[model samples]
Target: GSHMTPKDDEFYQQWQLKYPKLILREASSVSEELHKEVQEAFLTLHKHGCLFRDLVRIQGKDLLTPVSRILIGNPGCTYKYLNTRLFTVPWPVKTEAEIAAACETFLKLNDYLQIETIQALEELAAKEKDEVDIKSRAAYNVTLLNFMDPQKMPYLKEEPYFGMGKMAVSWHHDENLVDRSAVAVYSYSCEEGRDPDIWHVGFKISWDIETPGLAIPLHQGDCYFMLDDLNATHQHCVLAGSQPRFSSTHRVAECSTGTLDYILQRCQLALQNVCDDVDNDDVSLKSFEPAVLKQGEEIHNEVEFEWLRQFWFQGNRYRKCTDWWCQPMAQLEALWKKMEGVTNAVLHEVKREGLPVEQRNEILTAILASLTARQNLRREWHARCQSRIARTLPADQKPECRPYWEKDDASMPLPFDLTDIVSELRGQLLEA
Candidate 1:
């Protein structure tokens, strides 16, 4: 509703390219069926709420990645709806005004949008530079926003207007579409987060190495935007806009060697779960840190830490900080190409070197799961250390310390993959 740019042909082409075969076609002979298809498409878009697709789903409106780029802005951030998990923040408002006002920022966002009131959608579409199309679309969007028209959302289980009702659109994974805009319609809130949280702004890639690349969701991108949308959509579109600006400096500081220790604990626990599976004997041959992240602490003696240090900037990459497709494109694409093959090649080397699958699993499992656990553990450990130091020290002896984290979440230990861990070592740079 707030920062939308004018739509044009360039954008429409991009939309078609991005969506490929997703757009609904009214080519059938029956006019009624075509009308129904139009209605269904609208309902699907409405049920999904403020998705990037929805921004261009309307006919006659063209949206380009650049258009999305120019308006959503780089310092942009997004918030996803909080599931009933430990990945979200708690809400403070009980009043309607407080909740609604807080949600406005997120609601107006075009990236990981949180379409709130029937009026909010109306406001956004009504201001359309497309004039006729804008009004017609606005009229449709507003009407759809006003009530949960079951005929439109045939599943009858959708959470359209607010989060208080049951939405079956999200539960049917058996019938899951590529982009389940259905799920976007609603969600629940849980004040939890990655144990050692991560915040990424844009895509990350490698230039010096060969092989293709791999990409994962950047923490700072639209993750939070989606969460905020979830919160607002579920909270009756109440507190969506009032979300806080994420604090990544603190998160970055939290991802340290100290945090790795805590992450090890969790890894050990996870390992214990899989220990009985095929790797117990070989797993026993590894050390704690490198064995797990690298070769069960057996791959290398020294630790690595480059990913954190590089901390790629999210200035201009594949997508948005608030939009759904945002990430540090270069690093990610590189990883996607190389990670699988490189890892396989490395495994083949290790196999030629006579390592068994059990050993491989022990090391690879940790690496595979590193992103979630390492970041979480680091944050947890940091918080504990902070609290302990604070409690033990005398008031006068207190050192000058500031809150160092992105969200208001606590800190923990983090354990990472060996290649990943070793790659971060500044010691190598010094040697070089």
Candidate 2:
């Protein structure tokens, strides 16, 4: 799917020297004509029925008043930037908007980019000698897209500007990514000379030391990659450009639940590796932390395990309202735990070293192949919850007044005021 081939290893090497681990390339995958059309599509969404909400504080304080924005991706995906939570308003349904087809086209293009980006990573990984070079086994699923006006979005004295004022995004990571995740950001803009300033900020928690993140220029028609472990250690952000720009950033995650859960799952998989080593007598149990590697106690040394361990528990510590909605939302937590249990157990047995090679490969393959129901179920529940909330409002305030993205497979209006679907889904969980 990638149309651009660099001159050689030196092509990417130059970028590495300037901004280590950052992948920047000029590709014709998205032609100039298509880029213009998509940007025009964004303007269409802006003109018709788009809800542009202000960026709010962690507890919901008004931050930045912006125009039309919504998370667009596979159902159930959600995102958070600094303090605000952004849910997918979804693309409008065919019954509602004429641009729906164009929206579909834009979405398909993003999916292609996701596949192409991972292939690039795989090729680069093959050129390296380490196991950590990069793995391609886990296919990247779409996270979402954030649309903002680059020229007018003001920089707050908060975050990336905690101590100063600047037209830039604060130091942050796409906390919603998995191990082999490559966040491919495809930027579009019509104006020239309003390039963004990209920065890479790093720190050592124990040492309390801060190293300056390098600032590099990013222009229109360029796609950049925030690849591999760089997300775990360094924080990055792009300064707002002087010209108007739109960003369609694709992030990949292991599950719908964000960072801590992803790390916990990684630790669990790594623990299975440790346990396999023990069974083969390749390593002693003494090297492992948490003495008894029970469920969720798994830890590996490479990650700032000490830091991530806290985040995992911090999630549990506040259990009641960590999400932006601030509702108990116990079901979300319950579903996450159940999925994690099943996947980890499946992985533990499937990845064992002593099994027949073909049988072992088949087990892991089957487990990965059959996991979408978990995400789909979550998507349905979210849609239902939003529908019910809308149902409770007065007729004038209901979301039915405006267009909304229907379940892609559905042909009619969504059912409103329904609440029993949670239990309605329990029996069907295994039906898949």
Candidate 3:
């Protein structure tokens, strides 16, 4: 009755007894062709500079950790993890075909995973009818691609802890994911001789537990899911091998109307600010004209109304300022401030409207929450941009990477103030 080998089935039964929410599938579950496509997609994304390290805040300090990753998903959705809000990057015009192909591959894999997760949930529900309550249809809109190269991240080889060796990902529960929703993970490795025991996924109830905890070996091409409360109740981490590896983690990221609206409003305001600067005879601002024109075309082409619209500042039109290295910090900051002014005015009106007290409070709370999230995102963005700049600048101008435990160096000011919009909205609500 079991698809797994006798030994493997025994292992699964043992683990399932201890962790009922775990779903482990062998490499045979997914076709070789699909794995090949996924691997190629990862390589394509990596080659296009889509996978790069970003600043992550751990403990109380900002750390330049080595996790080459990227978020690819539905536009207007944000995934907050490790104190950083991850957003999908806009592709350059030249790489549109490649990027689209790669994204399509991920979309296909997501479809497969989504179906598998639903089946798993149904099986669980049938067995325990009273305990399981399916709230919403599964929508794994976010796929986080992580490519770990041991050479680039040497610390992955170090065994600092007693039982854990080569900590590719530290122990933590996923954040900002939909509650009671499952997360599917597919693993790929580039090593010649693949040893399943070389890497593992360590799970634990709490950090204080001294024992090694439960470790499940994840082999190449294997797919697994942590269903429902497993993510909420247990923490998990990746213990890495020396080989270069890639993992595609699919989840239903938390998306609220408030967040989507805030992103849309910010995009509109940013575009307006760019246009105004150009009209004022700022020649450098002309670089954004192409992007503005494209957005205009998109708006007209859509037949049906879309709640969430995609606005991008990347591509050939903004070729001069597309990358972090070439961006004009002062000019960008000025434009951002102008956008903030517009946002502040809009929030002020919401505060002044004669709505019911409860309704007013709800509106303000959603906007303020969205504003604060964006503020955190902007802080991380600035840190990432500055780190990129620091690496490329001339010897004298270049800054050293700070220690992991140290606070972020404030020597270079951010292009825009991180907390201005959030604080402004907070003050308005407080006064009301």
Candidate 4:
């Protein structure tokens, strides 16, 4: 049910024209310099422990499971395809400068992909007789950097399921993208001497079709564009290989009005709680009041948060005053439980009110949007606190709470030690 090279050149050309939505370009289109920069960015993020497997909710169920692959992406943008909420990159505390610098490289890649997608769409419009409205559109702000590193991803070694064995990502349609918008992907390898032809992107029509599924090779430095209706009509997956690989996927994520309103409401509510908790005499804690107020005002005034439209949504910058990192593990855990309780109570009230179905659905969507943020906050806070404790513990006791990056299986064993880089970054943060 698969063919690497098509039967004939002309026949292949005709097949591509018939299904023009999937456009593939070779690696030469992108410069070597850009590829190196992007790879370095991925490495930096990985070293900082920004990439990890996300706990995704199964469709229409409360059950959750860790994704097969690891990822880091724009925060706040709901990616429904995986049924998981992407949290903010947990840049170690006091590494704001490094985080900002790393994001600049991602922004550059984003711009390149955005323009490439637009041009591809324009060409598709010209080919088709129907008038395609190629209007000025918003930039693709959702940048999901996916990694299938064998050393880190244990799920890759698991037994086969649904007759698909050892997949980097299972088959699924991207559901959270804007209608008719294009998704751009750039692929590269983390290992220097890895084979580029090992993996391929497997595609098949979702509906019953007698034709065989197509397997297209996406070599290192290659790029692809999934144009209008492609995700809707076809399901795609990464048939992973043994070597470590990375892909940066750019898409125009859906930010509905309801989600925006919900975010604003949650910010305001958090601000109220902060104000009520702070005492006037406590100078250190009192400082947070004005900061929270400023954040609230920005959310209230803006139609859309400018931060979300740019590079990664810097949730730490926006929600800095909440000070989740400053608290102990016990307090953070308590707060998480309290938030869950409040959410449940609110949902109960909404059901009790017996509102119209459409209105109730909107309210529920807004309320549930906070679930991912809460989970992420707890996870980050726990990791930070544990890492700090691990540092102070005795050598024999440290193994019990070893930081993730220190684990043998958590990262690749490079020739050079990462401790040198870690210490340098730590010194810089201290100096700042």
Candidate 5:
């Protein structure tokens, strides 16, 4: 529900050319009968309140919404994003048969996708200078089912006006499905009124690149494979629909070596009997920072500080910051490209012909100062954006949404070292 600009139109065209590989087709591999059966399984889960109460950021409290969700997995499989964190509940006995059968089908689809994605990643690596460690892959041990119905606000009954729950998931990449190996979606019961467009918002790595994209309308009995490259670049989302819509997405992640076994053993010890039933209310979610995000601290200077900042920015390239995308960062992104062009030209001229040592140092110092000023502007905008969201939204909804770059280097390290470039230019004077 935001305005699209002419630039967005231009970016969309570029995004089209580089569209991440995606597969949309009839889920004929699975019997239509079985697909409908699984759809009913989700309906059954919803009736039993198995779906976790989705909280909204209204006023100061983390009030629950009716758009319920549940994560089903072998054991210990979990996912987190924004303010919501989910833990895998022990496989449900009530819906086990249907879900188990469905997982098999989903896995088969994901297997084919996994090979294709790795191929794409390899191709991408060839073009990149740094090693994109798209490793420690996450396997699809779990499936997340989102149940949305116009009439069901059992959780939001307190808010009587919360009718026809309008959910417009903003554009986002699935990068947060950390170390995710393969991701697939199964759409069912998507009747005319319930169905809406699922848009691919194109390739965008802010400050570096952007492209406009396409939208795919998912239908009943449709299976979609989200290519990893697509997952990395494009952000997809659902606009508000007129009626109820339900879908289940399956993902396999390779958590740390023992994560799965640890969870499986824990489930066995806790549940005692696998036959017993458990639901979201029965399970409490674990909340903690993933140990990996703390990778870019202890910085020394403005250059290095901004470099670390870029790390966090790139990781959350897909996030919109809030209901809408973060505008300040996008604005700064546009400005940086201009500064970068000037910086490149200056460096090129310096290399093209020799300059007196004092002149070279003066130019280099000015360049560094300019870059530092640009860095201050970008960082200031981010801090203000973070503060605005924290002040206006509920604490829960605000997930301390800050940069969390896992690696030490910025997305694009200073391009060329300032000191080294000057050293070479200055060395020319001594030789002369």
Candidate 6:
């Protein structure tokens, strides 16, 4: 695939970092030409306000080249300056007309960026995308979570080899495993038909802190680890939605739910915000806190966890199958219980102290524990499936279907260093 040969698209469809909705290909475009087009389009996007919806849609299919697709798929953005406001009504235009004009202008920039960028990107992705030297990320409070913990009942691997080819045996444990400082972690795997050098594995971690009933609505902090190279980005809680409840609207902007979940569910406090309208004043003025959708029901774009845990712990090595360290179910449960207690404690003192740093840390620590328990349980389940195949499946089938046990293997990805994915691939300016 790195060779950028005709077989690249024919044999491997390159993965687009953004707007990776549908799998696609363009057989005729050359790799060198793609590079030229993307460089041009990117320069143009900087000049325009990106009024249209998607670059790919505005540009047409010709720009659908891997590079162009990246530009098109990449979401448009706005960087409004602090307190920058301008009234848009002309002498002949009324308030409504001005509103319309403002919206139209936005639409135009967006449309133009999408289309033109796509056209340009078509030529950028052609020259062989198989970056070498991969990397790994190992933070976010790793723990040995077992079901017996407070967070939930424990589930054991039904088969040896970590539940290789079977369902996990559900059980319970008695320990504090939930960490309050949980950061959600998500994984982006390889895709079929894509160049390996271009796309690398990505992961993310995020957290939402809720206070019992008071100061503001929902608030959160989001972070992304696109590659293993420490190429991370953050989206803290911001304010730009409809309403009084919007004051504390999860200031954090959600990441690209790159096919992680089919449904787009949003959460505000205990409420879900998937369909809430933050654009309209009426919508914003309402006291709607938003609904809480189920994990899979939420809009997940290339995510692999319920939500990423935002805490980091580095001393966990679960070696024994049933040893306490290997089985932190008890620890997880204890953390969950502790988290709720801390949350209660913080609520009492927030008004006076405005959330002390230490209390916040304590709460976050407990949440991370709950998250660890969840992933550990999931991993055990996958391992069990692999074990079953080894012990019972036919030898031929064993080789062909082994990956089914590893859910992360299902996501499409390449072998490139994750850092490149974060910097060059994601448009983040890390190096020269």
* Each prediction's whole-model lDDT (CA): 0.24, 0.43, 0.58, 0.50, 0.43, 0.22
Candidate ordering by TM-score (highest first)? 3, 4, 2, 5, 1, 6
lDDT of 5: 0.43
Q: Where does model 2 exceed 4 Å of error?
A: 1-15, 18-20, 27-29, 49-51, 59-68, 80-85, 89-95, 130-140, 150-165, 192-212, 254-432
List the RMSD of every prediction in angstroms.
21.8, 17.5, 11.4, 15.6, 19.2, 28.1
Ranking by lDDT: 3, 4, 5, 2, 1, 6
Off by over 4 Å in 6: 1-95, 126-432
Cα-based lDDT at residue 197, candidate 5? 36
Q: Give the 10-residue window scoring lowest on summed lDDT in candidate 6.
A: 243-252
What TM-score does each of the candidates earn?
Answer: 0.22, 0.48, 0.62, 0.57, 0.43, 0.17
- For 1-432, candidate 6 gives per-residue lDDT tens digits of 011222344222322432122112221222444333333333333233221111111111211111110011111211111111111111111224333343333333333323332333333334226111110011111111111111121332221221111121211111121211112211111112212222111111122122110001111111111122112221121111111110000001122222112112222221222224432212111121112112211222101222211000101111111122222323332322232222233223322356555543443333333333434544543343345323454443231211122325422222111233223312312222
- TM for candidate 1 is 0.22
User: Which lDDT tens digits does candidate 3 get at residues 1-432?
Assistant: 011222343546656675778888889989889988988988887887777565555765545556777777775455767655555443222236777788778888888888888888888878775223443435787888888777666345433343555678887887777777788999887761123336667677655465335667677888888888888887888877767888999988877631444544545544552445443322122222334433332322220012111112111111221232123323333444444443444444455657555655555564555455555644553464355444554464332221111225342222234366567657756764
**Tens digits of per-residue lDDT for model 5 on 228-319?**
55566545554344446676777654344224344333333322211235321122212111121011011122222232233232223212
Q: Which pairs clash in the backbone of model 4?
A: none
RMSD of 5: 19.2
Predicted structure with the largest lDDT when compared to the true one: 3
lDDT of 4 at 430: 42
Report lDDT (Cα) of residue 20, candidate 3: 77
Candidate with the larger TM-score of 1 and 6: 1
Error of 1 at 97 (Å): 31
Off by over 4 Å in 3: 1-13, 89-95, 129-137, 157-162, 192-197, 207-212, 257-262, 265-432
Better-scoring candidate (TM-score), 3 or 6: 3
Higher-scoring candidate on lDDT, 2 or 3: 3
**Least lDDT summed over 10 consecutive residues: which range in candidate 5?**
290-299
* Deviation in Å, model 5, residue 274 alpha carbon: 33
Number of colliding residue pairs in each model: 95, 2, 0, 0, 15, 115
